[PDB]
Amino acid sequence: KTKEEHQKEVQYEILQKTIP
Amino acid sequence: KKMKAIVEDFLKRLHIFDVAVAPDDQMYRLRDRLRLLPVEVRRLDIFNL
Amino acid sequence: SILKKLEDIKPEQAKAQTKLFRIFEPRQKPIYIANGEKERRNRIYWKLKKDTLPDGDYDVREYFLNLYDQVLTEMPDYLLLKDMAVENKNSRDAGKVVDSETASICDAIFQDEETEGAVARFIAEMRQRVQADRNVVNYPSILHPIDYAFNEYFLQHQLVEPLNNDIIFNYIPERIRNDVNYILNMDRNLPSTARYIRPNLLQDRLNLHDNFESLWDTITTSNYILARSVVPDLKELVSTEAQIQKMSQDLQLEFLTGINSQAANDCFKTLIAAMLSQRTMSLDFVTTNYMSLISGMWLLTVVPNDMFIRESLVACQLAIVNTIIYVAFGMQRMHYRNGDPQTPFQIAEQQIQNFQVANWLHFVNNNYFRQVVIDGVLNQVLNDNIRNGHVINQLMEALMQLSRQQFPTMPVDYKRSIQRGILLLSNRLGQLVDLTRLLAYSYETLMACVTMNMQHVQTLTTEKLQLTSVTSLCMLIGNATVIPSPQTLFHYYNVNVNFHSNYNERINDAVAIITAANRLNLYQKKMKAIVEDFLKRLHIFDVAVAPDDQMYRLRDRLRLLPVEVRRLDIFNLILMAMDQIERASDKIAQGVIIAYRDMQLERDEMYGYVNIARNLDGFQQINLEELMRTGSYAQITNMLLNNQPVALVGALPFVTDSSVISLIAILDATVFAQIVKLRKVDTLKPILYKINSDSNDFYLVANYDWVPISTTKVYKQVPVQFDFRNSMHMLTSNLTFTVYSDLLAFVSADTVEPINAVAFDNMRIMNEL
Amino acid sequence: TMSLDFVTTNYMSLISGMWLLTVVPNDMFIRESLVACQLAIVNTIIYVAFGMQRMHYRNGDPQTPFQIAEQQIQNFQVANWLHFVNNNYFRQVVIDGVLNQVLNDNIRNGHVINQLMEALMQLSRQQFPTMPVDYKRSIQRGILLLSNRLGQLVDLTRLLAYSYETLMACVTMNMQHVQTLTTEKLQLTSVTSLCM
Amino acid sequence: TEAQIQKMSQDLQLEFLTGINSQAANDCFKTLIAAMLSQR
Amino acid sequence: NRLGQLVDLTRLLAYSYETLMACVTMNMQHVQTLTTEKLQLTSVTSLCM
């Protein structure tokens, strides 16, 4: 699950890098 | 006069944003929105003078 | 072991093109007048950026194949145009350009005192125009027409696709959303401008399910390992010691070996995984263990025949029939020869008279799978009488009849032991019903999460499974239901789709390379290397095991499949313009023409006085490739000895000589003696005449004003002139879009209450309240 | 925009989410949370109690599952409550040239809580067929627990309405209504804590 | 040779196949061609 | 599963036989003889595979 959480954090960080 | 710099200053002076993250296409859309608005009379008259 | 190998697959990386793929770049060269003097103003023409082409037409074709491979490997998937932008210092409208080298070219042209002002003003007028209301931008670029065509083709076939929440909601396979026992949830929105990549969902085209059992068995083993990793464990098992003592009391002894929780878990996982991946299994049991026989009989009642090796099935059927069935009614025991097409159960069905037992045997005989196509994926589904678990009753009734007959021609103790075994199995009817329904639902739900075609073909490696674990599972199952965890299911689905996409991508790459190689008339390339690269890149094999013969058979199998459209058009474009790329090189020529007649030379605005023959009409064409390939020298030697016109076509390195002394003293034809003397044309080096003012020997052609006359010409084409107004283009792209990968991490699912689970028929899964 | 986070094994979470959906208009959330909560609630309480097959459903239909529930159940109390929740949306009004989104009057005075309590009490004495013993007993006793707080729930919801009115009065800039990228995590357990 | 031996052993499902080496293959090939030539 | 390799092997054998037999001067009859040469079947399998 830890790897899954890391992947989801990566995806949400990619999304968040488009929000000021 | 690169309108991107002016829009950057405008966004940064709202105190609730972060310019270094904004996307360029949305910036261009905002610029095109700004291009078509009529300016308030005081500043227009100052420019005329 | 192999679990890491099959679980460490990440989606194939989408390359981000940092700069446009360049083959041609501008170069500034001097020019001469028709008389042969410097013009004191240089002009810029086109030259290849890379000049590593070796001599020999076969090596030329090899270089072309390598170039195609490099282009396809460096393919851009999503092409950003805002990242590749350097501000031009000379655009008086403060524009921006596509590449840094484009900026360097613009600066060079803008600052050259020998150039006019119209081109400079055109340079200064370059500016990008952005139209964000339709999500389109325009950029300026300078390229050779081949490069511009390639860039346009890359631009207009991007793999992105608009993304919306409902699209991901529909990205899950249908047989998961449609069911009620699983519920999906999101926690974030998606913008209207974001894009993602669709994987490839095309079925097998190598027919690895037929006549390729080695790799097929390897893949089946890998998927079986994965399924064993994914299938959920069991929870709330009855205490082993209490069950053991209760069974011991029920049997009245004054057998039970091999009953542990680990055995039940391993049996459950192995059975489900083998069913899922179509990996056949073999059984093994002591023939004198009646309870093992009855547990195996139940196992054959649920699982169909086709998933069992003929040896194990025959042994199990023989033991069952000749230890219970004919023993019941006291008929002569059957001698089923090992190897008859008939099965022992079929003969028993054709023999016995009683109703229920014959009906149950008939059911277990012909119970085959059904092939059903759902959502473009082929699957194997059990008969509907097995999922609702009613057939188990049709089992038990028959077993109940087995408790009524007197068992003639047998001692009382044997009958007592058999009755004890059948009673112990009978009293657990509800447990068996719940276990069978759970197995059916779990198999359906899990198997609905695979996206590759499956076939029911026995493979070489066979799974080992003892029946004692099956007996333990049938005696130890309890009340708590087991539903696969959504996180594990999604992880398994992600791994499977990643594997399928990798397989399809490698298949397409190999097909494209082989098609190009066979269409470029390549025949001196050992093709096992490409197959080895493919197998290695699949990332499950070791090329140290599979030999070359299977590689060649796979190549022959693979040639048939038509290639994908994009790669086919890429090859068509790269082949249609082959000659222009090959001839424009300044390191190799295209042949030598010999006439032994006084002929004049040509005048060009890039070489001055050069010996060039634009066409080859009016002569005999001899192929240098064939000359080297077959080793013959008959026709050429006889043609040259008698001093008759000849023409040779092929790749040859050139030596440049710029001395009028060499022009007057004929030395451009004395490089043919070695062909006769050495009888080898690998190092044929024709001499390229060239006369101009740079060589400090042009005063001869000026004082006496004579027209140079030679006896040889070199098959070379003057490079095309460069015009800035034509290479200019307005590339089209998208403004900005965030590429998304690993999409399923954005959806979370909650398990339903284990008690309230519903399998398929609007009813609870387990019911032993 | 509020995302809904829950653990489905806690049926009391969905029971409290019933009140949450009744009070807050469904257009304030994202579609994923709404469809998930509706499917869970419908396939764990009501349709379980009324002897009907679990609601086969497909994500992305133009109609929310609650509409299908409304046009499939002929028990007047719960059907009326489901209809009220179905057509509960933010009301578009203009005050002094300022655009605002305000709640309906019926919830504002604290009256829908009586309807919810009556529907829950109707579900309490229901037969609840084809369900195990302890699960059904726990479900109906939790439903009784939430029903037994009628006056306090009425006071809480109308206090929320009054606070919303007072705070929204001083808002100067208009507020549109459109879905957005990010959301705020709402704790279902915290909602149950506030309700109880 | 080792890989081919492994593959043949796996495929034949052995519970014989010994005496398989490149030297033996070369000797057999030479023997066959020579016998066909000299009419042995 | 070794079709192409077997084809190449057999026709290579045929070509080698042709080339070697070309230079034979004395004629060859055909009649059975006393002795023979031991051909290893396992070696034949090795060459085939």
PDB file of C-alpha atoms in Angstrom, chain C residues 133-266:
ATOM      1  CA  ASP C 133      -9.810  30.510 -27.286  1.00  0.00           C
ATOM      2  CA  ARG C 134      -9.439  27.461 -29.567  1.00  0.00           C
ATOM      3  CA  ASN C 135      -6.276  26.123 -27.852  1.00  0.00           C
ATOM      4  CA  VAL C 136      -3.940  26.632 -30.808  1.00  0.00           C
ATOM      5  CA  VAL C 137      -0.613  28.443 -31.139  1.00  0.00           C
ATOM      6  CA  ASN C 138       1.702  29.180 -34.066  1.00  0.00           C
ATOM      7  CA  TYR C 139       5.504  29.205 -34.042  1.00  0.00           C
ATOM      8  CA  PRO C 140       8.156  29.989 -36.668  1.00  0.00           C
ATOM      9  CA  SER C 141      10.633  27.359 -37.795  1.00  0.00           C
ATOM     10  CA  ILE C 142      13.347  26.890 -40.418  1.00  0.00           C
ATOM     11  CA  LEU C 143      13.897  23.378 -41.757  1.00  0.00           C
ATOM     12  CA  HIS C 144      14.659  21.370 -44.839  1.00  0.00           C
ATOM     13  CA  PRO C 145      11.362  20.236 -46.408  1.00  0.00           C
ATOM     14  CA  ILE C 146      11.976  16.639 -45.287  1.00  0.00           C
ATOM     15  CA  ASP C 147      12.420  17.810 -41.697  1.00  0.00           C
ATOM     16  CA  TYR C 148       9.342  20.044 -41.918  1.00  0.00           C
ATOM     17  CA  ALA C 149       7.261  17.155 -43.265  1.00  0.00           C
ATOM     18  CA  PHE C 150       8.465  14.877 -40.463  1.00  0.00           C
ATOM     19  CA  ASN C 151       7.694  17.518 -37.834  1.00  0.00           C
ATOM     20  CA  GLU C 152       4.208  18.090 -39.248  1.00  0.00           C
ATOM     21  CA  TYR C 153       3.521  14.348 -39.287  1.00  0.00           C
ATOM     22  CA  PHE C 154       4.657  14.079 -35.667  1.00  0.00           C
ATOM     23  CA  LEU C 155       2.468  17.057 -34.738  1.00  0.00           C
ATOM     24  CA  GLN C 156      -0.731  15.853 -36.407  1.00  0.00           C
ATOM     25  CA  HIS C 157      -0.785  12.311 -34.974  1.00  0.00           C
ATOM     26  CA  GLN C 158      -0.306  12.853 -31.242  1.00  0.00           C
ATOM     27  CA  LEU C 159      -1.659  10.188 -28.896  1.00  0.00           C
ATOM     28  CA  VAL C 160      -3.288  12.540 -26.379  1.00  0.00           C
ATOM     29  CA  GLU C 161      -7.049  12.576 -25.842  1.00  0.00           C
ATOM     30  CA  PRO C 162      -9.331  14.889 -23.830  1.00  0.00           C
ATOM     31  CA  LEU C 163      -9.857  13.732 -20.255  1.00  0.00           C
ATOM     32  CA  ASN C 164     -13.029  13.978 -18.178  1.00  0.00           C
ATOM     33  CA  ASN C 165     -14.194  12.417 -14.929  1.00  0.00           C
ATOM     34  CA  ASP C 166     -16.773  10.252 -16.700  1.00  0.00           C
ATOM     35  CA  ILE C 167     -14.032   8.981 -19.030  1.00  0.00           C
ATOM     36  CA  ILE C 168     -12.045   7.550 -16.116  1.00  0.00           C
ATOM     37  CA  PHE C 169     -15.372   6.385 -14.680  1.00  0.00           C
ATOM     38  CA  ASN C 170     -15.724   4.399 -17.925  1.00  0.00           C
ATOM     39  CA  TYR C 171     -12.043   3.395 -17.980  1.00  0.00           C
ATOM     40  CA  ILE C 172     -12.731   0.666 -15.402  1.00  0.00           C
ATOM     41  CA  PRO C 173     -13.799  -2.659 -16.972  1.00  0.00           C
ATOM     42  CA  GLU C 174     -17.560  -3.006 -17.164  1.00  0.00           C
ATOM     43  CA  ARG C 175     -17.898  -6.221 -15.134  1.00  0.00           C
ATOM     44  CA  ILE C 176     -16.691  -4.327 -12.042  1.00  0.00           C
ATOM     45  CA  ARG C 177     -18.835  -1.183 -12.193  1.00  0.00           C
ATOM     46  CA  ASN C 178     -21.961  -3.133 -13.153  1.00  0.00           C
ATOM     47  CA  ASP C 179     -21.773  -5.233  -9.985  1.00  0.00           C
ATOM     48  CA  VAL C 180     -23.132  -3.851  -6.720  1.00  0.00           C
ATOM     49  CA  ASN C 181     -20.615  -5.354  -4.279  1.00  0.00           C
ATOM     50  CA  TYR C 182     -18.007  -2.825  -5.439  1.00  0.00           C
ATOM     51  CA  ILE C 183     -18.410   0.956  -5.277  1.00  0.00           C
ATOM     52  CA  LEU C 184     -16.134   3.588  -6.811  1.00  0.00           C
ATOM     53  CA  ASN C 185     -15.328   7.034  -5.443  1.00  0.00           C
ATOM     54  CA  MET C 186     -13.291  10.047  -6.562  1.00  0.00           C
ATOM     55  CA  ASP C 187     -11.755  12.895  -4.598  1.00  0.00           C
ATOM     56  CA  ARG C 188     -10.480  15.390  -7.202  1.00  0.00           C
ATOM     57  CA  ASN C 189     -11.723  17.143 -10.320  1.00  0.00           C
ATOM     58  CA  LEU C 190     -10.116  17.192 -13.760  1.00  0.00           C
ATOM     59  CA  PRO C 191      -9.633  20.305 -15.909  1.00  0.00           C
ATOM     60  CA  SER C 192     -10.982  20.565 -19.437  1.00  0.00           C
ATOM     61  CA  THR C 193      -7.456  20.904 -20.876  1.00  0.00           C
ATOM     62  CA  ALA C 194      -5.723  17.879 -19.341  1.00  0.00           C
ATOM     63  CA  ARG C 195      -4.845  14.908 -21.539  1.00  0.00           C
ATOM     64  CA  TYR C 196      -3.787  11.294 -21.044  1.00  0.00           C
ATOM     65  CA  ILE C 197      -2.542   8.315 -23.050  1.00  0.00           C
ATOM     66  CA  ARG C 198      -4.638   5.316 -23.962  1.00  0.00           C
ATOM     67  CA  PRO C 199      -2.836   1.962 -23.735  1.00  0.00           C
ATOM     68  CA  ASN C 200      -3.152  -0.633 -26.510  1.00  0.00           C
ATOM     69  CA  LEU C 201      -5.958  -3.186 -26.172  1.00  0.00           C
ATOM     70  CA  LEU C 202      -5.451  -5.424 -29.204  1.00  0.00           C
ATOM     71  CA  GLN C 203      -5.459  -9.191 -28.834  1.00  0.00           C
ATOM     72  CA  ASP C 204      -2.761 -11.740 -29.607  1.00  0.00           C
ATOM     73  CA  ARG C 205      -1.507 -11.867 -33.185  1.00  0.00           C
ATOM     74  CA  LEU C 206       1.435 -14.265 -32.742  1.00  0.00           C
ATOM     75  CA  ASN C 207      -0.882 -17.190 -31.874  1.00  0.00           C
ATOM     76  CA  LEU C 208       1.260 -17.993 -28.846  1.00  0.00           C
ATOM     77  CA  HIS C 209      -1.548 -20.323 -27.729  1.00  0.00           C
ATOM     78  CA  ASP C 210      -0.645 -22.665 -30.610  1.00  0.00           C
ATOM     79  CA  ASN C 211       2.656 -24.333 -31.537  1.00  0.00           C
ATOM     80  CA  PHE C 212       4.756 -22.037 -29.299  1.00  0.00           C
ATOM     81  CA  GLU C 213       4.315 -23.834 -25.993  1.00  0.00           C
ATOM     82  CA  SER C 214       7.668 -22.808 -24.471  1.00  0.00           C
ATOM     83  CA  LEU C 215       7.125 -19.049 -24.248  1.00  0.00           C
ATOM     84  CA  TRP C 216       3.407 -19.619 -23.660  1.00  0.00           C
ATOM     85  CA  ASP C 217       4.216 -21.793 -20.643  1.00  0.00           C
ATOM     86  CA  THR C 218       6.673 -19.173 -19.384  1.00  0.00           C
ATOM     87  CA  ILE C 219       4.027 -16.442 -19.608  1.00  0.00           C
ATOM     88  CA  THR C 220       1.467 -18.716 -17.954  1.00  0.00           C
ATOM     89  CA  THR C 221       3.879 -19.411 -15.095  1.00  0.00           C
ATOM     90  CA  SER C 222       4.467 -15.685 -14.603  1.00  0.00           C
ATOM     91  CA  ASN C 223       0.747 -14.874 -14.591  1.00  0.00           C
ATOM     92  CA  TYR C 224       0.074 -17.795 -12.236  1.00  0.00           C
ATOM     93  CA  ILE C 225       2.680 -16.410  -9.833  1.00  0.00           C
ATOM     94  CA  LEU C 226       1.007 -13.005 -10.025  1.00  0.00           C
ATOM     95  CA  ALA C 227      -2.432 -14.510  -9.389  1.00  0.00           C
ATOM     96  CA  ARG C 228      -1.091 -16.407  -6.378  1.00  0.00           C
ATOM     97  CA  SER C 229       0.231 -13.066  -5.132  1.00  0.00           C
ATOM     98  CA  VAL C 230      -3.086 -11.273  -5.655  1.00  0.00           C
ATOM     99  CA  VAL C 231      -5.804 -13.757  -4.610  1.00  0.00           C
ATOM    100  CA  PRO C 232      -6.980 -12.797  -1.097  1.00  0.00           C
ATOM    101  CA  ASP C 233      -6.186 -14.905   1.945  1.00  0.00           C
ATOM    102  CA  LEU C 234      -8.756 -16.555   4.224  1.00  0.00           C
ATOM    103  CA  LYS C 235     -10.019 -15.071   7.489  1.00  0.00           C
ATOM    104  CA  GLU C 236     -11.694 -16.631  10.536  1.00  0.00           C
ATOM    105  CA  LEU C 237     -10.772 -20.289  10.176  1.00  0.00           C
ATOM    106  CA  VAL C 238     -12.093 -22.676  12.814  1.00  0.00           C
ATOM    107  CA  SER C 239      -9.515 -23.770  15.374  1.00  0.00           C
ATOM    108  CA  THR C 240      -7.579 -26.746  14.047  1.00  0.00           C
ATOM    109  CA  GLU C 241      -7.413 -28.740  17.288  1.00  0.00           C
ATOM    110  CA  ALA C 242     -11.151 -28.489  17.998  1.00  0.00           C
ATOM    111  CA  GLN C 243     -12.010 -29.612  14.465  1.00  0.00           C
ATOM    112  CA  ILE C 244      -9.518 -32.479  14.708  1.00  0.00           C
ATOM    113  CA  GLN C 245     -10.961 -33.757  17.978  1.00  0.00           C
ATOM    114  CA  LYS C 246     -14.551 -33.368  16.748  1.00  0.00           C
ATOM    115  CA  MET C 247     -13.788 -35.384  13.618  1.00  0.00           C
ATOM    116  CA  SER C 248     -11.992 -37.989  15.734  1.00  0.00           C
ATOM    117  CA  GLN C 249     -15.064 -38.342  17.946  1.00  0.00           C
ATOM    118  CA  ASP C 250     -17.274 -38.576  14.860  1.00  0.00           C
ATOM    119  CA  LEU C 251     -15.161 -41.395  13.383  1.00  0.00           C
ATOM    120  CA  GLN C 252     -14.965 -43.629  16.509  1.00  0.00           C
ATOM    121  CA  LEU C 253     -11.362 -44.759  16.190  1.00  0.00           C
ATOM    122  CA  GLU C 254      -9.377 -46.656  18.817  1.00  0.00           C
ATOM    123  CA  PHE C 255      -6.729 -40.624   7.738  1.00  0.00           C
ATOM    124  CA  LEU C 256      -6.554 -37.217   9.429  1.00  0.00           C
ATOM    125  CA  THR C 257      -2.952 -36.478   8.421  1.00  0.00           C
ATOM    126  CA  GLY C 258      -2.364 -33.262   6.511  1.00  0.00           C
ATOM    127  CA  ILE C 259      -4.934 -30.828   7.933  1.00  0.00           C
ATOM    128  CA  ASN C 260      -3.409 -27.400   8.583  1.00  0.00           C
ATOM    129  CA  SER C 261      -4.527 -23.842   7.901  1.00  0.00           C
ATOM    130  CA  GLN C 262      -1.527 -23.186   5.655  1.00  0.00           C
ATOM    131  CA  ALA C 263      -2.554 -26.178   3.542  1.00  0.00           C
ATOM    132  CA  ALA C 264      -6.063 -24.779   3.087  1.00  0.00           C
ATOM    133  CA  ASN C 265      -4.750 -21.331   2.152  1.00  0.00           C
ATOM    134  CA  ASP C 266      -2.261 -22.759  -0.348  1.00  0.00           C
TER     135      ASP C 266
END
